[PDB]
Enzyme design. Structure first.
Site, mmCIF file in Angstrom:
data_model
loop_
_atom_site.group_PDB
_atom_site.id
_atom_site.type_symbol
_atom_site.label_atom_id
_atom_site.label_comp_id
_atom_site.label_asym_id
_atom_site.label_seq_id
_atom_site.Cartn_x
_atom_site.Cartn_y
_atom_site.Cartn_z
ATOM 1 N N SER A 66 25.208 8.052 60.620
ATOM 2 C CA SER A 66 24.955 8.954 61.739
ATOM 3 C C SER A 66 24.138 10.179 61.326
ATOM 4 O O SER A 66 23.474 10.179 60.287
ATOM 5 C CB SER A 66 26.268 9.394 62.394
ATOM 6 O OG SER A 66 26.030 10.334 63.429
ATOM 7 N N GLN A 67 24.207 11.225 62.144
ATOM 8 C CA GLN A 67 23.329 12.374 61.989
ATOM 9 C C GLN A 67 23.809 13.432 61.006
ATOM 10 O O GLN A 67 24.722 14.197 61.293
ATOM 11 C CB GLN A 67 23.034 13.013 63.347
ATOM 12 C CG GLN A 67 21.674 12.637 63.913
ATOM 13 C CD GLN A 67 20.517 13.190 63.085
ATOM 14 O OE1 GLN A 67 20.608 13.313 61.861
ATOM 15 N NE2 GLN A 67 19.427 13.537 63.759
ATOM 16 N N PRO A 68 23.162 13.491 59.841
ATOM 17 C CA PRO A 68 23.346 14.617 58.925
ATOM 18 C C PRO A 68 22.827 15.907 59.564
ATOM 19 O O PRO A 68 23.154 16.993 59.092
ATOM 20 C CB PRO A 68 22.481 14.234 57.725
ATOM 21 C CG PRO A 68 21.452 13.311 58.286
ATOM 22 C CD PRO A 68 22.153 12.536 59.358
#
Ligand SMILES: Nc1ncnc2c1ncn2[C@@H]1O[C@H](CSCC[C@H](N)C(=O)O)[C@@H](O)[C@H]1O
Ligand SMILES: [Ca+2]
Length: 186
Positions: A37-39
């Site tokens: 997912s989104q860092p």
């Protein structure tokens, strides 16, 4: 190294340039936090807590321990709560393997926070709640910042501060996390 640099390059393009947060992040092999997912989300929430080495942090939702690790590089001590047992075990194990020893983990229910450990300067919650757990508010030190995903279907990341005895809420941006689950443990 490419991947570390690629990711940091990415974040800056997204509008995340806090040197503090970018270095914390760059230091951590993201691919290692998928052991068993989104860092961007991690960078933004982290930036919002406005951390300082003297900050006492409570994290809700230890998970892989990735965001835990980010926090630990930035503050002197982190207190983190995960309700899933095996997840707590792992994350705990990862943090020791990276010689990150300023973290206290707890198998428990974040809805309740971690009162024992004094008021917290920063509170990070990484699971969605339909409403702010009042326990968390109660555990927010003066001048403290809280970051939390709020809502159900629709979700917004919120930053709340306690200043002058008054709580102030800022709606940041739309997100989608898994639910903060109340009740028993797993
Ligand atoms: N009531 C609760 N108290 C503490 N943790 C909870 C919780 N409800 C859900 N969680 C945990 O919150 C996590 C959301 S994923 C959180 C991401 C984590 N910060 C990471 O870097 O990987 C899940 O692990 C879930 O088990
Ligand atoms: Ca910015």
């Amino acid at each position: 190294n490419p991947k570390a640099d690629r990711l940091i390059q990415f974040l800056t393009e997204q509008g995340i340039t806090s040197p503090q947060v970018l270095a914390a992040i760059h230091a951590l092999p993201r691919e290692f936090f998928v052991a068993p997912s989104q860092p961007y989300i991690v960078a933004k929430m982290t930036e919002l807590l406005a951390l300082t080495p003297e900050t006492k942090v409570l994290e809700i939702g230890t998970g892989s321990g990735y965001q835990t690790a980010v926090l630990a590089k930035l503050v002197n001590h982190v207190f983190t709560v995960e309700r899933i047992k095996t997840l707590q075990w792992d994350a705990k194990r990862r943090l020791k393997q990276l010689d990150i020893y300023n973290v206290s983990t707890k198998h428990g229910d974040g809805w309740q926070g971690w009162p024992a450990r004094g008021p917290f300067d920063a509170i990070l919650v990484t699971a969605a709640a339909a409403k702010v757990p009042q326990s968390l508010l109660d555990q927010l030190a003066e001048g403290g910042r809280m970051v939390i995903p709020v809502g159900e279907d629709e979700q917004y990341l919120y930053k709340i501060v306690r200043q002058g005895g008054q709580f102030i809420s800022e709606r940041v941006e739309a997100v989608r996390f898994v639910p903060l689950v109340a009740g028993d443990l797993a």
